[PDB]
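Support case: user asked for a sample of complex input and structure output to validate their parser. Sending the pair below.
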Amino acid sequence: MLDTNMKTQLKAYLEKLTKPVELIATLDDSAKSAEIKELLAEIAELSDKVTFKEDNSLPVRKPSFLITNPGSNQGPRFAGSPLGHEFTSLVLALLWTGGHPSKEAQSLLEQIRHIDGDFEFETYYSLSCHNCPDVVQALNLMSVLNPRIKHTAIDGGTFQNEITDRNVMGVPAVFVNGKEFGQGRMTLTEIVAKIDTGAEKRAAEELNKRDAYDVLIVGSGPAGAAAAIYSARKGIRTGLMGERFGGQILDTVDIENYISVPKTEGQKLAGALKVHVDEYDVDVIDSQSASKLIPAAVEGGLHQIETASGAVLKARSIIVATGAKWRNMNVPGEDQYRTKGVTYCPHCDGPLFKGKRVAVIGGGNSGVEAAIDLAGIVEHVTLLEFAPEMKADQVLQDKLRSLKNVDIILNAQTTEVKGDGSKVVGLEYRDRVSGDIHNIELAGIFVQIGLLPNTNWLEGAVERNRMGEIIIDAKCETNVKGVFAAGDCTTVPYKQIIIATGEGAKASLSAFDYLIRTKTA
Amino acid sequence: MLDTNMKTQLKAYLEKLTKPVELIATLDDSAKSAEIKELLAEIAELSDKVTFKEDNSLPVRKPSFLITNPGSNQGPRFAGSPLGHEFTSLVLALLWTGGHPSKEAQSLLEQIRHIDGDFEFETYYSLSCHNCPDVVQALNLMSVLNPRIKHTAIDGGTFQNEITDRNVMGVPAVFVNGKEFGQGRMTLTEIVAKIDTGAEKRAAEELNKRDAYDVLIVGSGPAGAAAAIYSARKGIRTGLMGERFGGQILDTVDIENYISVPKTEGQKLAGALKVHVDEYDVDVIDSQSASKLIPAAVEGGLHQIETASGAVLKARSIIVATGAKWRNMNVPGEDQYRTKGVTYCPHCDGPLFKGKRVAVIGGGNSGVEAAIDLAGIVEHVTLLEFAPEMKADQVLQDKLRSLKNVDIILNAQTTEVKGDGSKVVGLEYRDRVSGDIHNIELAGIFVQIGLLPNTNWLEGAVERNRMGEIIIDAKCETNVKGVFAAGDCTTVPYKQIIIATGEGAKASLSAFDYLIRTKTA
Ligand SMILES: Cc1cc2nc3c(=O)[nH]c(=O)nc-3n(C[C@H](O)[C@H](O)[C@H](O)COP(=O)(O)OP(=O)(O)OC[C@H]3O[C@@H](n4cnc5c(N)ncnc54)[C@H](O)[C@@H]3O)c2cc1C
Ligand SMILES: Cc1cc2nc3c(=O)[nH]c(=O)nc-3n(C[C@H](O)[C@H](O)[C@H](O)COP(=O)(O)OP(=O)(O)OC[C@H]3O[C@@H](n4cnc5c(N)ncnc54)[C@H](O)[C@@H]3O)c2cc1C
């Protein structure tokens, strides 16, 4: 029941068919079936691409027909008349099956193809209905895009039995796997929204779709945060990736040497840093770990960062600010009395133990210097050295032995940190030689065993010194063009917040100068 | 009228005389005069050092006598009986004249000697008076210490005429140069306090009396302030000398890139810095200028700083943080529109001119980079170069010429900054070749002519690069052992507050390590 206008329009659209289409009907002896049979034969006459076949054995509605390709069973099924306002739905279904492209967003299309489970759709419409087409067309497009999705468009006029049995009052009305799905002017996008039930392991996939950065900062402590702020103020595309925004200052309490701020808290300062970063256009990526650096193969190319999560980020320039881990005694009492007698920084907490007795753990330059420093502030210092001798420079060793409020203990290994429920009161150690245990009364324990820069993931890529520190010049340049580094992970002689932030700022401006000089050529 | 006990005590005290004393009396024929004459002859009998002379011509009180040395007229004069409670005053006056030392503080003594004007003292006492001696003795000691001070101690019992005429109701009562001076238990110190009327040019003299410092920081901007804080926390003797606490941040307003602080003011930040410095034991010296560095002649010796005011400070270690001056256009309108369109920092104020038109002054690397930077943020940039060509690197020159919102003007000299009463609206410049004047409409003027590190006063002492920047290594060490430098005055590639403060911190810890290694040996 096509008129001359419909037939001519179909001649035109079916010329855009690049693949053969087949129309497989399943029919009874009713007038409705004769109407569909006449229709399909008329559509087959308008193109040598379209073919009308019949199979009245199949267990489907009668009349109905499948729009598919030769040697296939994938495609949309019309049940009843696909004419009226559904005529464009019919035409579109032929084109799509025929290899003509969809007008939908390309991303949305791939989401249909890569879909998890089986869904059997069926929509109830009428020929008079104005809204039904968009729904039918949308679902039709899904069945064409992947065979796991099936769709059968029911004409209510033909199948009055179903719309009256299956209690639908309005059209369009959609069903899935038996269950009711929804009604009304559904878009394609919102149907794909309800159908996809996916959660985890998506973050990595979100990161590969990410565009290349002008600068990508790896690590989000004070150094990375400062670099991010200085970078985003130049208006360049700035990404700040880290494991845990805040870095080492998150697990500290009282900070009294961030210049211009007599006393703040670690958590508060980490929060302030975030606020300041968020003032500018900075793509902040949290809970991710750089696992590898792949340096660019050409000047003016892109460095790449691989994540433990499987993603790969890319950038014109990189700033490594991954900081360090400060080595622990690894003994009972240690964790419980951190910020509360157990400390890892003589520069930070030294002033707090005036008149108190303390221990330093470690007999290297760090430890021995620390003891000498503290010895001028505190009542008494005891240095515990694991080995039979201190590794520190001889000048420092001599200086420490010439102090009247200092005990050196060699072959000493800490076994326990002792407190009173809220604060340190003493220390337990083992003589490694005799095996004996001894106790020391004290208020503070300064752990100076060593620093482990978080840089082993860069082995081979950028040059490091013999301590794992990333080697840098005054401009924070590494041996790799367009890779910079800032803060504790680098060769900076001292490890502090105010120092780290300055370096972060330095590395940002050095990265920016690098970009200026590499964009034109 | 000495008894046996007085005479024997005098034999003993007059043996401590190292210089000859003379007692010159001026007498009449009264009983009082015979009493004094008998006294002086009895005192002369008790020592071959003491001599009794008489001169009744002199125009002084009668009886009275001067305690002096041969061939001199300097000394205290007693008028009437120096016996009773004034006997120790008499003895003390002889000892002092005789070369026996004072029991007074040595500093206080030199203050008497080095005193400005002429003062003629005279004290009224009685023999019964308990308090009078300390006053008399004090003033006596002054007349002995310098001849410009004169003192005459009047016995009220002998000279009833004066205490009744000159209306004194109580003793002791002191007079100066005719005028009344004061009464009661005056100390020496409080008399010297009222007598000295000195004000200016004392600060320099206060600085030489100052003890040597562990570390002396020269310059009191962000860098010096941070160094001072880090130093004073180690508990060492820390001095912070500068011309004007606050440095360059005092003459700025909005600061938005001090990390962890989204927006502060220069004056506020300078104040915060002061508060933080004052939390620790830091000798802050303001309004002074280092004019010269004299490096120590030995390892473990002392560096010295000379001031323009004439003082010399000394220290085991030095940190130079004198910053820089940012060169001006030197034109009308410039001063008036600073912080208000005229700026000297692309990193600081670049973000403020989104959508605005700006000029950069200077065609060196700083200027050209600045233009390239701003060109990405602002509507339009115009670079004015004084010379016929830009000095900048060719890569940068090419990059700037390849930008669509940029004008380069050569042979251009700024003549006027134009505003509307509160903000910049344009610029006036001269073509150096044709002499013509031209106007440019704009909102911002970024002056990038050059930096002048405040370091010329160090020529010869510490090595500088070809830009006047103090050369330093990652530890902020100069070529002179125990001299460090931090901030804009050094070779740090970038000049910013957060950068400067980090360096200040670095230099402090490097200075401290230097001290540890130089004290024992
Ligand atoms: C308990 C404690 C108290 C302290 N108190 C003070 C104090 O009072 N004053 C002071 O000045 N200093 C103090 N410090 C030192 C100060 O915290 C550090 O010097 C400073 O935080 C270093 O900044 P940073 O950004 O260079 O490194 P970090 O702070 O260590 O930050 C580096 C960040 O990068 C992340 N990261 C590491 N590896 C990767 C990777 N592969 N991929 C992605 N991200 C990664 C880390 O998880 C971390 O979040 C203290 C340190 C500790 C441990
Ligand atoms: C107008 C303006 C705005 C700025 N805005 C910003 C901003 O928003 N953000 C930012 O990060 N940076 C900004 N800066 C830069 C920043 O102020 C400097 O980088 C920083 O102040 C340098 O610190 P400094 O201690 O090393 O030097 P300075 O700040 O210059 O301090 C050095 C001090 O030493 C004194 N001194 C000099 N010679 C002697 C001597 N012979 N004896 C004794 N004392 C001496 C000086 O008078 C001064 O007080 C701005 C600069 C200017 C000029």
